[PDB]
Amino acid sequence: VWGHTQLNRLSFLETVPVVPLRVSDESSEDRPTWSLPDIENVAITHKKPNGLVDTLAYRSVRTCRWLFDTFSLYRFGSITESKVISRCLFLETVAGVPGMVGGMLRHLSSLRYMTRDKGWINTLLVEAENERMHLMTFIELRQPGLPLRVSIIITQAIMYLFLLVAYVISPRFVHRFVGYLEEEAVITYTGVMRAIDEGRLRPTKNDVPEVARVYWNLSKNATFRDLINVIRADEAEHRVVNHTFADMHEKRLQNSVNPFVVLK
């Protein structure tokens, strides 16, 4: 029921105070679809940096981890729900940035050179959305203080700008920087799940929020452990995909077709 009569209306303002808020609208219809026994066997992997830019990309992520794990006491003391969710609530505010600068910029280019993009943009945006559904999820399990919020705001100002210019200078540097961040994120989310398997972390949030149960399509009886498992598997897809784009840059392939649009 979207046709010429609706296309000729000036505005549908007047219909806002009667539309349901619905958790399944918060994203596109392009949802991850995982099966837990399968993605159960996601694994920690490392790709060798293959020259200066890769090495410089890796040294950066590795530098930031050591830095980030230390100014946020993440090794000091036992693992906890509070510290884990707090970590991921923050780190996901940054994860949602690179895909939107990457998607924007290729869009921006495509229009000003009138070229095809051959599938890249789309992958890049729904990654960025996916990463933000990780946050929409986490922000429901824990609300943060003025400190952590302010500190989040100041971060985006920094990571947005850096990724903006990094992507203009060298897309290859950015796609390898995210690829390596995802290695670190499949290590974190594996450490969280391991801990659950080994009793060291007894999750309490085992009510998976509504945003999350529809987005990944989890059963009503899904545990916090199941939520980490699927989040984890999105980070691995990101891992393979950005590394593949990084690689494609390296080999003069930024204007060949996005291999993942078929491989879907």
Residues near ligand 9AU (CB under 6 A) are 61, 64-65, 68, 88, 91-92, 94-95, 155, 158-159, 181, 184-185, 188
237 C-beta neighbours (distance < 10 Å), count = 18
Q: Is 3 in the site for its own copies (CB under 8 A)?
A: yes
Site string for its own copies, 73-102 (x = CB under 8 A): ----------------x--xx--xx--xx-
Which of 23/148 has CB closer to ligand 9AU? Answer: 148
237 is known to lie in a ligand binding site:
no
Contacting range for its own copies; rule: CB under 8 A; set: 21-29, 63-71, 201-209, 212-220: 21-29
**One residue of 68, 72, 83, 122 binding its own copies per CB under 8 A:** 122
- Amino acid letter, residue 61: V
Quote the CA–CA distance of 140 and 121 in Å, as a whole number.
29
- Amino acid letter, residue 23: V
Quote the CA–CA distance of 29 and 114 in Å, as a whole number.
28
Quote the CA–CA distance of 91 and 69 in Å, as a whole number.
11
Site string for ligand [O-], 224-263 (x = CB under 6 A): -----------x----------------------------
- Cα dihedral across residues 181, 84, 128, 105: positive or negative: negative
SS (H, E, C) 190-235: HHHHHHHHCCCCCCCCCCCCHHHHHHCCCCCCCCHHHHHHHHHHHH
> Do 100 and 164 touch, CB atoms closer than 8 A?
no
**One residue of 84, 86, 92, 129 binding ligand [O-] per CB under 6 A:** 92
Q: Is 112 in the site for its own copies (CB under 8 A)?
A: yes
Question: CB of residue 87 vs ligand [O-]: minimum separation in angstroms?
Answer: 11
Question: CB of residue 99 vs ligand [O-]: minimum separation in angstroms?
Answer: 10
Quote the CA–CA distance of 111 and 37 in Å, as a whole number.
43
148: helix, strand or coil: helix
Question: CB of residue 262 vs ligand [O-]: minimum separation in angstroms?
Answer: 25
**Annotated binding-site residue numbers for Fe cation:** 92, 131, 134, 182, 235, 238
Residues in contact with Fe ion by CB under 5 A are 92, 95, 131, 134, 185, 235
